[PDB]
Amino acid sequence: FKPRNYQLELALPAMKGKNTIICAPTGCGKTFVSLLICEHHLKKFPQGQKGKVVFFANQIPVYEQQKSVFSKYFERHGYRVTGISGATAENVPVEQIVENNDIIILTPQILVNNLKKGTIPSLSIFTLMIFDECHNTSKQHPYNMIMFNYLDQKLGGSSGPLPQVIGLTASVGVGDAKNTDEALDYICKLCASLDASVIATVKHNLEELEQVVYKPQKFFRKVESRISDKFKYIIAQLMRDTESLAKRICKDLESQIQNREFGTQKYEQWIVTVQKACMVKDEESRICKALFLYTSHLRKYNDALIISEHARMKDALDYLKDFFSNVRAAGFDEIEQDLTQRFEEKLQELESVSRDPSNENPKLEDLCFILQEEYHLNPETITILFVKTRALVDALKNWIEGNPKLSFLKPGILFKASGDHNILIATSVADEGIDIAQCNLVILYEYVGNVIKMIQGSKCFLLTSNAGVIEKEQINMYKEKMMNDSILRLQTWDEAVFREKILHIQTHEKFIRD
C-alpha cells in the first residue's frame, strides 16, 4: 500500500508536529494518513523514550476497523497495540492498559469516565491524539469533554506536557452562519476546540485525489413551462369531452385514484385502474367496451400532453396523428369514427399553434443550450439523458436528429456498449432498485425514476420544475461555498497571527466553563 501523493501532502504539517485538522473527502484515506502520522510520530522518540498515541473513534464500525488495522501494522513493528471499547472486560482497569500499550483505539466516552474517576490523572501521558470525525468536537460531546481537560491544563499553566492533536473530518461544518464572515468565526471555534494551528486540505494533488474518489459535480437547474399553452388548452378540452361521454354511460366512474390531472403520470395510473375494471347483460357488456375505448383515447391524450410539456408541440401532435392513423388501420368502430372526427375538428388549430415560434418550449431551449455549451467544452463527451416516459424517448431523439444546432450529437435510444452514439436517451421503471450510469455527463430531464449512480470533469445536471428543491440546493451550495473560502482564507494568515485568534476564544470559553 504505497502512500498516495495527496495523502503525503495531508500528513506533512502533522509530521512537522503542528496540531492539525485534516479535511478531505470520505474514503480518500484520512485514517490511513493518521496512521502515517502515527508511524512518523513514534519513530521520533530517542532510545529509552516511548511515545503514546490514542485514536478516538466516533462509532463502533470505525473502532472495529481501526482496531484491526493499527494492530496488524504496528504489532509487527514491536509496538503494543490494543483497542478498549464500551463492551469492556470491566476487570482490568483502563490505566494499566494505557500504561501497558503504546497505541490505543478508544471510544471517547470511556476515557471521560476515567478522568473524572481520576484513574487517568492527566492527558499528558498521551503524546498523540487522533479524532476521527473531529467536527463532533463541540456542544458537550465526549471529544469536547476530553478537549476541555486538555485546555484547562494548557491554559491554567502550571502546564504539563500536552500531546499533539489530529482531527479527521470530511467537513468542518459551517453551522448557523448566514455569512462568510460568520462562517469563518464558526470554523475557528472548532479549531480552538481542537487546538489546531493548521487546517490541511489537498491543494496540489487535486487531479490524483479525484481519481481515487469519484464525485461528479452536481448542477441543479430550474425549468419553466410555457407562459401560454394553447395546445394544452385544446387537448384538455378534448379530454374533458371524452370523459363527459364516459361519465354519462357509467353513473359512478369513481376508481381508487384521486385528483387526476391531465398530463400527469398519475392520470396514467387512473386510466390503468379503470381499464382493469373493464377487463373483468348487453348493456353491461356494451358499456364496458365503450369505457375501454374512451380510457384508451384518454391515455393517448395524456401521453401527448406529457410530450408537449417536455418536448415540442410538434412531437406531441405527431404522436397523436399516428395513433389516429393507427385507429383507422383497424376496422373502424362507429365510436372511433366519432372520437377521430372530434380530433379532426381541432387539428387545423393545433397545427397553427404548433407552428408558432413563440409557442416553443422553454425547457427544450434550456436543455439544448446546456448540451451546446458542454459539448463545446468537451467534444469527447458521452451523455445519458433520463426522461419521464417512453414516448418522450422517441420525441427527444427525433428532436435532436432534426435540430441543426445539435448536429454534433448522434442520438441513441437506451457501458459503453455502443461507441458510435455520443448521447443516449433513456427512461426507467420507478422502483426501490437503483439504475447505474457510466458516462461523462448525466442529464435528469424532469426525471422522477429510481435514483441513479454515476461510475467511472464529469457532471450531472438535474432539471426540475420544483422551486423547493432548487432553493434547498442553492442554500447547500452556498454553505459549501462559504466553507471553502473561509478555509482558503485561513490558510493565508501566518501561524503567529492565527495562533493569537485561537487563544482568545479558548480563554473566553474557559471562563464561561469556569
Curated annotation (Swiss-Prot):
The record places domain Helicase C-terminal at 363-498
Q: How is it modified after translation?
A: Phosphorylated in resting cells and dephosphorylated in RNA virus-infected cells. Ubiquitinated. 'Lys-63' ubiquitination by RNF135, which occurs after RNA-binding and homodimerization, releases the autoinhibition of the CARD domains by the RLR CTR domain, an essential step in the activation of the RIG-I signaling pathway.
Region of interest: Interaction with ZC3HAV1: 1-514
Q: Which GO terms describe its cellular component?
A: actin cytoskeleton; bicellular tight junction; cytoplasm; cytosol; ribonucleoprotein complex; ruffle membrane
Q: What is its main location?
A: cytoplasm
Query: Subunit structure, per the record?
Result: Monomer; maintained as a monomer in an autoinhibited state. Upon binding of viral RNAs and conformational shift, homooligomerizes and forms filaments on these molecules. Interacts (via tandem CARD domain) with MAVS/IPS1 promoting its filamentation. Interacts with DHX58/LGP2, IKBKE, TBK1 and STING1. Interacts (via CARD domain) with TRIM25 (via SPRY domain). Interacts (double-stranded RNA-bound oligomeric form) with RNF135 (homodimer); involved in RNA length-dependent activation of the RIG-I signaling pathway. Interacts with CYLD.
What name does the UniProt record give this protein? Answer: Antiviral innate immune response receptor RIG-I
Give the residues of the full protein shown: 241 to 792 of 925
